[PDB]
Symmetry: D2
Subunit: 237 residues, 4 copies
């Protein structure tokens, strides 16, 4: 079983597995049942922005999602990620559709991790930034339905030629390089992630959402993780 830490942008209320009634953002530690959620007024057809942040000093994982000219949704959770994740991980974006559907379009993605040592008092750092995605993006591991190059975007879930999202769809993009996320010898470990997204539905009911996630480096899409499981979890436990 993969080890997963995620921020979910959850557009569809699965009230039988702990979702609230409304679209929401959440912090998932090893379960689709968010440890903490906040209400989120997803805006259909509009470009949004997620900022995620962590440091080893506060051990607080925080996410902010916003649209131009709207109040933000933010959620926070105290978690020592040295006790949850392995030392080496991969970072990625995940999305799914079920019975109901939406485009899961990423327009940009950027990430920064830092280790600042006690042993030496010197820093190890990874930073990547995509504002365009190309038809053949060799620093990305695309899983399931995920594709790149259509209008320089990353389409996480399946979309027809006229541009209609398909249901029962799942897809993920991971950064090729493993990331050293925590280290005993570090005085401060920090990571930042930012992405922009276009979730468009023809339905008045979009599903299922987008997640930024951290996994074991060999993470793959769990079997039957379309719909409410967001390509992250094998089950709703």
């Amino acid at each position: 079983a993969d080890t997963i830490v995620a921020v979910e942008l959850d557009t569809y209320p699965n009230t039988d597995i702990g979702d609230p009634s409304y679209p929401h953002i959440g912090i998932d530690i090893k379960s689709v049942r968010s440890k903490k959620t906040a209400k989120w007024n997803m805006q259909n057809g509009k470009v949004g922005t997620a900022h995620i942040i962590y440091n080893s000093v506060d051990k607080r994982l925080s996410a902010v999602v916003s649209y131009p000219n709207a109040d933000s949704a933010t959620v926070s959770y105290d978690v020592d990620l040295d006790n949850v994740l392995p030392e080496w991980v991969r970072v990625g974006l995940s999305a799914s559709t079920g019975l109901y559907k939406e485009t899961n379009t990423i327009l940009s993605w950027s990430f920064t991790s830092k280790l600042k040592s006690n042993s030496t008092h010197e820093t190890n750092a990874l930073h990547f930034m995509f504002n365009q995605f190309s038809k053949d993006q060799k620093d990305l591991i695309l899983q399931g339905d995920a594709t790149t190059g259509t209008d320089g975007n990353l389409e996480l879930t399946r979309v027809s030629s006229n541009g209609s999202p398909q249901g029962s769809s799942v897809g993920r993009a991971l950064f090729y390089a493993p990331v050293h996320i925590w280290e005993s010898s570090a005085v401060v470990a920090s990571f930042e992630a930012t992405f922009t997204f276009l979730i468009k539905s023809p339905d008045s009911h979009p599903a299922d959402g987008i997640a930024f996630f951290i996994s074991n480096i060999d993470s793959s899409i769990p079997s039957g993780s379309t719909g409410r499981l967001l390509g992250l979890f094998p089950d709703a436990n």
Copy 2:
């Protein structure tokens, strides 16, 4: 008077103004009487490192002080710096000596500020890094006894040719450029400050310490601020 937010590396217990019995790190919000302290095993004559981090999501000022192959002292305080600081500030380093004395030597200093905005959705940023200080450092405002250029270091307080620190000394260094520290239109404001320092005392009693501080742009050394007030405060209220 000046408006001050500070992290103090305080080497001298002034127990009649709320100091603990031991050298401590402290978060000061408009008062030398730290809202929060932690024990700090300052190591006479060694190069130490200070990391300060704030973000407008967690609203939590944190400091970590460390030497090679020792435990860290860390201290944190929940505070909304929108309700304490004016929108525009200067950042600096202050130090002091009283009856008792120490080198207050700064070997390097870096600082990073970001506003990432709502309604606009476009980031403003400032970052500077000093790994050596020159004899005439025109992007630093030197106050009091603060000098630059000797071993390419910043000496906050007065030192002899023969290496001896003087008492009743006080000095500060401010980054020339004002800093946009918070904005009501920003979804995430954050900042990071790192400095390395060498505190050496010929006595078994070093005084008084070093602080990173954020002030009103026209901040100057208050009268009588030598020793226990660290160049930061006019009195001990």
Copy 3:
């Protein structure tokens, strides 16, 4: 007088002071008479981008100007900026109007300077980024008609409420902080400047242009520098 190094986006051929017959980009070293120019197909009313890059290894000032879906204009000049500029400078943007007029609108501006040193072997750096300008931007020195805050843009030259650019206007914006541009103890000095701009003229004859410039720290708009001198030079020598 002031010491000036500049890249000019020059929209008006002043053929009696060495200008080519066409709108051009130019590298100016202590003279409005560009040491080097290239043809530039300035696009009335579009957002353009300017990239300037220098390094003390190649000793080569290069500029690239581009619009979406057009060819770049690029210009380069071998010059040792240790023999032209004082050790400490300010960086800025200048613009001008004469008989003829244009918006000189700056939408964003970023700058990066590094000294990486010998005998010391430790890097000094400054970086600032403006993706929006506020009504009161305390890290910019505004000279002449330069204003900020309207559409969160920097208007170098005078514009009406009704959107109309005025003639015989001149304006500049300088980064507040002085910049350590070269050091004799550095193995590699380098810098990078990026700005996006919108030049709109109601006539089929726009004038006069925008420049990124590096000056002595106390640089001010020379007398009579409107129109063809671009706020940079007192005369056309």
Copy 4:
């Protein structure tokens, strides 16, 4: 046959294949026979620093190597790398020993690549930094004799337990992630690489050197590329 672009730190004069009489730095475009060389006073047992830089505007590949308190060696060569390398590459460090030997110790390595588009006018960027290396460094592809974790360094060539370098040795470290080094749609492509190194010999004759290199992503150590071929080339052509 791999496609290779390298900066060599060449400690041993192979005068039969175009080496000068003395230790030297060089730019290798698809041949061990440097297109351009400069004299280099390698300092045995001392920590050195290499800075490599390129941009698509100058199409000039430049390298600077220096020690504390010594004059630098620099070399430059005009090369359009869009005409030499594939669009996607891996970056790495390479070193070899032959009949004669040296430690090929890397203490730190950092890299930055940038693409800034015409199609969009938005940037794609990779930056990594190692100041420590760990016993198990999963963002590095180690080939041949290369090992990590001994004193937090990367040993490129084989060294005994007492710390004696072995001859007929070859080794390479590549960044796990493929790098998008050039792109038609880019107005400026730039890359920076920096590393620090300790070359120590017991001999008064060290060999064979260190190289920073760019290759096709599947690059491997050519057969018999110990000695003068630096783990880069199958032959001296």
